[PDB]
C-alpha cells in the first residue's frame, strides 16, 4: 500500500540520478508531484517533462541534467511557524548559500526564502540540494 | 447467574467419593440424559427409558440401543459394512 506518492517519485528520481540515466519514468502522478517538479524546473535542476494520459492516474517522463545531489521528503508534514525556519534550515541544508527547503503554504508551494519574503508559514514537504 | 464453576451436574454429590470419580460420573451422565434425533419422524425427542431402551416422545417408537447413548460405534461400523455390500 502506497501511503504516499511523492516519496516514491522522489526516491525513483534520486536512484536514477545516481547512475546517470538521462531519463526516468514515474508511474503514479498527481497535482502535488507536478507542482514539485515545476519548482525544481524553475531552479534549473531538471529539464522538461511530459505527462502521459492513460484513462487512469497518469505517468510522467522527465529529462535529467546530471545535476541533482539529493531529493527526498519529510514524511510527517510538521507544521512550521515563520520564526522557526532558521533551525530547520540549519539542521537540513548543506550550506547557507545553496539548497532549498520546500513548504506548503496558504499561498501555494514555495521554498524558504520566498516564504520569508511573503511573511508566511506552513508545513514541510521536502527538499533538494 | 452461573451457580457453579466446575462440577456442574455432579453438585448433587456434595464432597463425597473423590474428584476423579465425580468427573467420570459427569462424563457418563451428560450422555445419559440428553435428547436424540428420531430418524422416523424428524423431531429431536428420543430419551432413554431403561438401560437399553430408547423411545420417541412424539411418534412413540422404541429403539434398542446402547447403555448410555443411543448408538455405540461398534454397531455403526458393522451396519456400514453390511450396507456397503
Amino acid at each position: 500500500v502506497r501511503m504516499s506518492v511523492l516519496a516514491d517519485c522522489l526516491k525513483t528520481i534520486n536512484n536514477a540520478e545516481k547512475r546517470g540515466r538521462r531519463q526516468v519514468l514515474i508511474r503514479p502522478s498527481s497535482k502535488v508531484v507536478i507542482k514539485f517538479l515545476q519548482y525544481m524546473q524553475k531552479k534549473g535542476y531538471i529539464g522538461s517533462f511530459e505527462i502521459v494520459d492513460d484513462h487512469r492516474s497518469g505517468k510522467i517522463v522527465v529529462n535529467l541534467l546530471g545535476r541533482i545531489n539529493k531529493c527526498a521528503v519529510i514524511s510527517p508534514r510538521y507544521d512550521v511557524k515563520l520564526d522557526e525556519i532558521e533551525k530547520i534550515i540549519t539542521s537540513i541544508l548543506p550550506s547557507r548559500l545553496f539548497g532549498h527547503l520546500i513548504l506548503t503554504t496558504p499561498y501555494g508551494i514555495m521554498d524558504h526564502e520566498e516564504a520569508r519574503r511573503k511573511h508566511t508559514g506552513g508545513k514541510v514537504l521536502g527538499f533538494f540540494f | 447467574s452461573r451457580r457453579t464453576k466446575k462440577v456442574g451436574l455432579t453438585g448433587k454429590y456434595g464432597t463425597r467419593y473423590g474428584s476423579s470419580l465425580r468427573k467420570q460420573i459427569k462424563k457418563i451422565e451428560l450422555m445419559q440424559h440428553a435428547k436424540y434425533l428420531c430418524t422416523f419422524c424428524g423431531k429431536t425427542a428420543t430419551k432413554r427409558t431403561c438401560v437399553g431402551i430408547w423411545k420417541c416422545k412424539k411418534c412413540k417408537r422404541k429403539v434398542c440401543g446402547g447403555a448410555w447413548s443411543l448408538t455405540t460405534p461398534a454397531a455403526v461400523a458393522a451396519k456400514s459394512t453390511i450396507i456397503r455390500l
Binding site: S75, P76, R77, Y78 | -
Partner: protein, 144 residues
Amino acid sequence: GSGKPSGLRAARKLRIRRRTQRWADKSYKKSHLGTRWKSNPFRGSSHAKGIVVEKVAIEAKQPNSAYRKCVRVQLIKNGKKITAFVPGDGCLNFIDENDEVLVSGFGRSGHSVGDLPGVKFKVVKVARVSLLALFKEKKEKPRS
C-alpha cells in the same frame, strides 16, 4: 520504517515506550529505587561519626601481597557496624580501643577500591583532630 511509529498522532506510544525502557538502565534504576534509603549505612549522607570497636588487618588481592590496616566502627546514628581503612604509613597507632572518628566515602561510592576486598569507607579524623595534620606530625598532637 525503522521499528518506531512516525505519525502525527502517535505521541502516546512513544512516551510510554520511553517510560518503560528507562528501568533497564543501571544508573537510572539505582538512583530511583526506594530501597537505597534502607541498604546504606550513611542513609544518604557524605560523612558519619562512630566509636572504634576493633583493629584488624586485611589481605590484599591475589597478585599483590600486603596486610592492610583497618578498624571496625559502630555508628552513633543508627548503631550499624562498618569497616574503614586507615591511610598512612604508621597512622594505626594513633587510634585506641574506643575513640570517636569521622569516616567518609572511599571514592567509588558504592564500590570497593583497588586492592582491599570489601571496604568502602575511610577514616578522616580521630579524637576530633585531623588525621592528616597528625601524620604530618608537625602540626598537632592528640587531645590526651
